Amino acid sequence: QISVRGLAGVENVTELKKNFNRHLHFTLVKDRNVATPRDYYFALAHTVRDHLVGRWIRTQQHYYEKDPKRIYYLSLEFYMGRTLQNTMVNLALENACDEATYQLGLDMEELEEIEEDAGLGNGGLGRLAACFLDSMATLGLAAYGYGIRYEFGIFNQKICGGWQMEEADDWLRYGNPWEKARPEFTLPVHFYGRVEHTSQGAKWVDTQVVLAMPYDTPVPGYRNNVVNTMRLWSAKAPNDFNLGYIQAVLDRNLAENISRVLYPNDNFFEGKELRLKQEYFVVAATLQDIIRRFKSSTNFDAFPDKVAIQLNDTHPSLAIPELMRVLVDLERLDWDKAWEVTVKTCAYTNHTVLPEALERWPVHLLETLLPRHLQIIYEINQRFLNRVAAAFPGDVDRLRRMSLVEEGAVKRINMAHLCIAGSHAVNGVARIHSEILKKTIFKDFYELEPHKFQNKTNGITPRRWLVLCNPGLAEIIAERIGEEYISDLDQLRKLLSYVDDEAFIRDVAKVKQENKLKFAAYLEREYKVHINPNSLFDVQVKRIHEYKRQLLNCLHVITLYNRIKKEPNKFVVPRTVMIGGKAAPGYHMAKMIIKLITAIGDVVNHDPVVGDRLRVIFLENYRVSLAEKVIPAADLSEQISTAGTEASGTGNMKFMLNGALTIGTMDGANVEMAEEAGEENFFIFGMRVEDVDRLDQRGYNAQEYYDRIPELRQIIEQLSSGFFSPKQPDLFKDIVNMLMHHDRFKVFADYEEYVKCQERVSALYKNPREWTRMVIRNIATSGKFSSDRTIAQYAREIWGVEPSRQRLPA
Amino acid sequence: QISVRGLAGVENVTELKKNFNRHLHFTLVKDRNVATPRDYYFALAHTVRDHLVGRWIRTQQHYYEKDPKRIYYLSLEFYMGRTLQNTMVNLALENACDEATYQLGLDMEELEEIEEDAGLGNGGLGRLAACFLDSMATLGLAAYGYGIRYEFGIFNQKICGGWQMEEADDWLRYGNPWEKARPEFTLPVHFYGRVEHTSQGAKWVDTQVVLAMPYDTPVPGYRNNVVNTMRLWSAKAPNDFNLGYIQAVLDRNLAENISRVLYPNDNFFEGKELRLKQEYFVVAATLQDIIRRFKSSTNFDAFPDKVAIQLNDTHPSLAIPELMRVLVDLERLDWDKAWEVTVKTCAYTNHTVLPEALERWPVHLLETLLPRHLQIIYEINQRFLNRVAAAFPGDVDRLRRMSLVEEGAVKRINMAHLCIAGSHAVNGVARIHSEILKKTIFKDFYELEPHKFQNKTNGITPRRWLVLCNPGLAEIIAERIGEEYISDLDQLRKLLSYVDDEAFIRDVAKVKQENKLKFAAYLEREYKVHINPNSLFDVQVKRIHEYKRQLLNCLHVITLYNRIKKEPNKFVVPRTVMIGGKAAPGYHMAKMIIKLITAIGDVVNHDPVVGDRLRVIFLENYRVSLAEKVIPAADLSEQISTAGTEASGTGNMKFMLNGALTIGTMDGANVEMAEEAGEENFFIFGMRVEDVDRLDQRGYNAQEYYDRIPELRQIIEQLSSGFFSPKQPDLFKDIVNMLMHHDRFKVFADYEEYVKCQERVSALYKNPREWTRMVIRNIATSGKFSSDRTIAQYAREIWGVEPSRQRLPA
Ligand SMILES: O=C(NC(=O)c1ccc(-c2ccccc2)cc1)N[C@@H]1O[C@H](CO)[C@@H](O)[C@H](O)[C@H]1O
Numbered sequence A, B: 001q002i003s004v005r006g007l008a009g010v011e012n013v014t015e016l017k018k019n020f021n022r023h024l025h026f027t028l029v030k031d032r033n034v035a036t037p038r039d040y041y042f043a044l045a046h047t048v049r050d051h052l053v054g055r056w057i058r059t060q061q062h063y064y065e066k067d068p069k070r071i072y073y074l075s076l077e078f079y080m081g082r083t084l085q086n087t088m089v090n091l092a093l094e095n096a097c098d099e100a101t102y103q104l105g106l107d108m109e110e111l112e113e114i115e116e117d118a119g120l121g122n123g124g125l126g127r128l129a130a131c132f133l134d135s136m137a138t139l140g141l142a143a144y145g146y147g148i149r150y151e152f153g154i155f156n157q158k159i160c161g162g163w164q165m166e167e168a169d170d171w172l173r174y175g176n177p178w179e180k181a182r183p184e185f186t187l188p189v190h191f192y193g194r195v196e197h198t199s200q201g202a203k204w205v206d207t208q209v210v211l212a213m214p215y216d217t218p219v220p221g222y223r224n225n226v227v228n229t230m231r232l233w234s235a236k237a238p239n240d241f242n243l244g245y246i247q248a249v250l251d252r253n254l255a256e257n258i259s260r261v262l263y264p265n266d267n268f269f270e271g272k273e274l275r276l277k278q279e280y281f282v283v284a285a286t287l288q289d290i291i292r293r294f295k296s297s298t299n300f301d302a303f304p305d306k307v308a309i310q311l312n313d314t315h316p317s318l319a320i321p322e323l324m325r326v327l328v329d330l331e332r333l334d335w336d337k338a339w340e341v342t343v344k345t346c347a348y349t350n351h352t353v354l355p356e357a358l359e360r361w362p363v364h365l366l367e368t369l370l371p372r373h374l375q376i377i378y379e380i381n382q383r384f385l386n387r388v389a390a391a392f393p394g395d396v397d398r399l400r401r402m403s404l405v406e407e408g409a410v411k412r413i414n415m416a417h418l419c420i421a422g423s424h425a426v427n428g429v430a431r432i433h434s435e436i437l438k439k440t441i442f443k444d445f446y447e448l449e450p451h452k453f454q455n456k457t458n459g460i461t462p463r464r465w466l467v468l469c470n471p472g473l474a475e476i477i478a479e480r481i482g483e484e485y486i487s488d489l490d491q492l493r494k495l496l497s498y499v500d501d502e503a504f505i506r507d508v509a510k511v512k513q514e515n516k517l518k519f520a521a522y523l524e525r526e527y528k529v530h531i532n533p534n535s536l537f538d539v540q541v542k543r544i545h546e547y548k549r550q551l552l553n554c555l556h557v558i559t560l561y562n563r564i565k566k567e568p569n570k571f572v573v574p575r576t577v578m579i580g581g582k583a584a585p586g587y588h589m590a591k592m593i594i595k596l597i598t599a600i601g602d603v604v605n606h607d608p609v610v611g612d613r614l615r616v617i618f619l620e621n622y623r624v625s626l627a628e629k630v631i632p633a634a635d636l637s638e639q640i641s642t643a644g645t646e647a648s649g650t651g652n653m654k655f656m657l658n659g660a661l662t663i664g665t666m667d668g669a670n671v672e673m674a675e676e677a678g679e680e681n682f683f684i685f686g687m688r689v690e691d692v693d694r695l696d697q698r699g700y701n702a703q704e705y706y707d708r709i710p711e712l713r714q715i716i717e718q719l720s721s722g723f724f725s726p727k728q729p730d731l732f733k734d735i736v737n738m739l740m741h742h743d744r745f746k747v748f749a750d751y752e753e754y755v756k757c758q759e760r761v762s763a764l765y766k767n768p769r770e771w772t773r774m775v776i777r778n779i780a781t782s783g784k785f786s787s788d789r790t791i792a793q794y795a796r797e798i799w800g801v802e803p804s805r806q807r808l809p810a
């Protein structure tokens, strides 16, 4: 049908059809008489998977022969989503498969909807790892993603009575056609025990053993015949485990609970033992695998020349003392040489400055679970603090500030401090974030070792986030400038010379309208909700957090509603306001925010006077597959975190690439997006970082805003009195109290500028031609935010490897 | 190489080789450079499995079109063993695969050894179910095996310091290529809750739900293109299970524990709740499947015309009240009609008369777990006892003896009494066993309903138990009488006309010698033990039980040793005495018996004066795959249970078919074996059932035997004084005490006749020609004990269906 989806050759279509029928028969053990749509999905999945195999085997043998430096990306999260369409895109198989299935009497899009998301992440951090894997393969790097194969990923969100309910994400129920179990590469991981000091070194003894079994998933590069590996560890009890008899067998579950479920608390660090076990489990198994591969090439001097380990946040920070443990206790290297190797091997990426999110493990936990690692951490701390004392003599307070060990009620290890000490590179994820790291939380560390601190602005893969989810837009772009932009996104700048092109303006606007119509139909078919497709699609999708200020959005919605009620016969630009995202199960305020959103919709959507002019919809179960649907349909992207709180954001970049205009604060990557597009082509409002600092010095008094803004006073009075909860008048008392007395994120302070800026949005939308021209200016300057650019920067400035766009033979 | 293994055609060998290479590449994702022997096994398994698929699909569609009466074999155990060689045999693929793998540079026998046994049974009862499935497929019956997919089967036995140690049988670790998951056929099973009585009947409400997910395994008939199904249920938590958040997800394990492990206690009934859940789980899921299939053909009058349910012991006895529950509570049939349907549908097979093995479930367990089933059982009991009272008026004691409810300390339900009341047929498993049922434990029931009671003498499949395990013997037989005996074992009688044939005598003896050499080599290669292959192979392999009298065997061994020590320079026929079998984990006396056997070997095998004349070996981890090895190598089969205790035995039949002579009591199927072969061709000794009864009336006094038999006195004195345990002199005090004071199985009473009979065995073995002629007389009359005969009798006399040897089109 469309060009970017590839060729549908006679030979290929015929071959795909027969391999499909072969899999339906031999693999699924079915005939066309008894086959369900799920059977048809699996037959297609297996057919496409067959095309990966040859390339997968030859890519790995290529790395063995050439022996390049290997990149190991360690993450507790890989938010992959669906794999089928992505594989077809990167293999240029999409049109061929579409044709093959069509001739078999099947609709491929219907079959694609049957695949479960691999929801092995919470949000931005997990999704970044996934985009990175795609870019590393596309850039021909010898890269491996290492993590945990959770049996249950991020919970499925159900909304019951306006409240979030959680249900287990049993994503493996029907099987996973993409993974290959490698039980022959199973590795032991040790826990508990005690440390014995012998004549010839320390020994970790009397440990409990859990087995780590790897599952490999192929990661295809974009049409370069490269297929890299994501290796995920599963927990297994050894066969003599606990070995009255019946209970011993049942108790094997305890060991296997390690890889059972993803922790969904992305807001607040809880020192839970099971999480600590997960963190060490992935680290210990991964590092044994790394060392084994390095030996199968005695001299660990060359280790950092052949190995780079990237730590995705502090979650795999135990890699630092674990590498020291292996080098010192097992390989018998002296401390100083082992430390040199470790530092040159490891690099650390930070993803937030919010203190409650930082991992600080109680010493008593590490003492019991990992006694030898604690000893190594103490030794790292002493040697590090000796360096600090020598550089800043007599500065006793610096010494306590920089210590890896935090004193107090319970002693704790600051894992971020560990990561900085044990890494040759530390990066933030957007320019403003990286500067904030150097100026505030890691200031002392920057003063000691300035050369360590870098920026690597985040990105998203244009394969999933344009070609896959928005083929209509990808095609109209390709008509003008060819196809090379898909793996060289900077080429989108060429679209600037089409900003006054009447045909292109019409096409850009047409694609958006089609996307909006398709999504409006999805909402009716799957959720029986009715929306006006001619309204402005105002969307905020992301995890529910106070710092992300979904609450500020809510105040604007109520403002709009109140203004309509005040002057009903006045014209307003119609809006569909969509808010979606999951709340961490223990985050009470976030769960109240969800209830508020649904409560507002309950009032707004049923007011006859409002009509089709304003609709408020909560997008249920927001996840990667839903993002791929809603983002192409958006007109307005809400990126309204308090300045200095969102490290980067990546949703922002997805919207920019897909033809939405952005209303946002100067926070995270928003700053760089505005810089690339031009501030005139961005809806910027609110306090900057400097303004927030000034308000903090003075003291933030929310009452001041309540007193001086009549429209805001009305909203608070409506909330308090039970306007949005008639049968439970005080339901939202916690929300009002927080806003009035303990709002860390200054919602009221940005209210006036936000409402004003929103009026400027509505004004522009009334001028369809000028709206679309501003959109073209955004798409055309979105190139910087390709994860190909981000990864090329990591490769050159941290890992010391050169990217390559060259093909491997097919 | 050999004829019975089929053709190795050019076309077939070429095709197998390319499908093997296809599976190694696409299925296993390996090349010949990195492939391990396990990879090669799996590639072969998948290649052979491909040949089953077409036949499997067409067999099931044939049953749909023809709609014959369906047989449902309900068992908690299916002791399947390995599947690869069995599949090749039944498909006539063995020589072709051997050739195909040979040309690829591989040894098929080596690859076969890599497959894990499906050890989903304890012993004879579980193995009977497996032989039955093979026979039903071979006889073209529309049969389904229904059971539980245990994650862990019978434990692997390790011998440490002469003691049994148990380790988990993680048989699914590397995956199972033979099964196909059918998550689309998942069914709910209910537990706990309460009964509500409404205007329009009883309702079972407020239940906890566990999901039952089926896995189908193909069961191929012998070269008839029939492939039947074994469906095994796996336990799954529903997705809203327990749905702080983390623990709720972890608690899903509790539901899934139902299908986790096989209960290994084949000796003594324990009322464990988890076992009760297993029993109901398989019954509830199976019966929903049955009814669904019956409807997909309103009128339950025809139900017994289209459905037969065979209960393998009382373990699935809950099928009776569960069928009543569905018919009455759900389908709204009246009690009397539902009961008529149930009785005509169900039949029950008993496997033992030992009272401690009988299932008697505490009422309080059924009250909590299955409240509605208890109510139905009480109602069944009342109506049944009303019939008893009407037939035998005034016989109050009969009423209490026949009651399904047993009074006492704890009230219990007698599941055997339930089974007889709710079945149109009740059978024992050998002629003497079935007579004992009518005369003793079920006497009252036989007097009420004599027409219900039948015999169905057990059998074994000649495919696994001759062709597969002893191809050398199968071939020399086929040379003389052709191949038709493999599915018509009665044809072996033709071998009687070769009893004086010098060539055949030489061949029969040659095959045995080769088998003995091969097994002697297996023992060195895998266990580093050294045996004389020219000695008589004296073997007793079976689960360790007091009634099976491994202890009597031990007394003979010590007698032989003592006689050698008394007269060292006297000639004795050399023997290798092999004893093997697992003990139930809680069975203390059985574990002591194992220790005794190893302790005897420790003394005997290291006495220089003995030399190669006597060796005592404990066969570790006895299981189906080991049986296939040791049975063809045996000269003497020990079947020495106390008369009236072994219901049938089936090991006895395996040995007879494979050229061992039998020393045994007149117990179980031994009686019929002696009858078929002639008592002159069998080594019969000891008390008959009548003699045991006489001794019980009088009182069994073991002291009498100790006082009057000097050779027995010596042994007991050796045991007591620490002769076999020098460092722990009183180690065997429990064994001596039991023998002297509380021996339920009269070991001393059969001692003299046993030793005497054993002398007659040694005498015959000295005459190789006459030994072999007696062997030929045994093989030639073993035809009755084919499970094809047993199943044809079930089909005609219980299920009301006609067997067919006709081919389905390929
Ligand atoms: O998504 C993020 N974090 C998480 O999801 C998260 C997930 C898990 C934890 C966690 C930490 C310890 C124990 C248990 C859970 C903490 C945070 N961070 C985001 O990362 C993106 C990629 O760099 C940024 O764009 C975004 O600004 C940032 O908030």
Ligand SMILES: O=C(NC(=O)c1ccc(-c2ccccc2)cc1)N[C@@H]1O[C@H](CO)[C@@H](O)[C@H](O)[C@H]1O
Binding pocket: B122, B123, B124, B125, B126, B128, B263, B265, B266, B267, B269, B270, B275, B351, B352, B357, B359, B429, B458, B646, B647, B648, B649, B650, B668
């Ligand atoms: O093997 C047998 N029984 C078992 O393995 C068995 C297995 C499990 C249980 C059991 C019953 C209740 C709870 C838990 C376990 C009871 C008995 N019985 C044997 O059956 C053969 C086939 O008919 C006979 O040849 C043999 O004589 C008999 O002992």
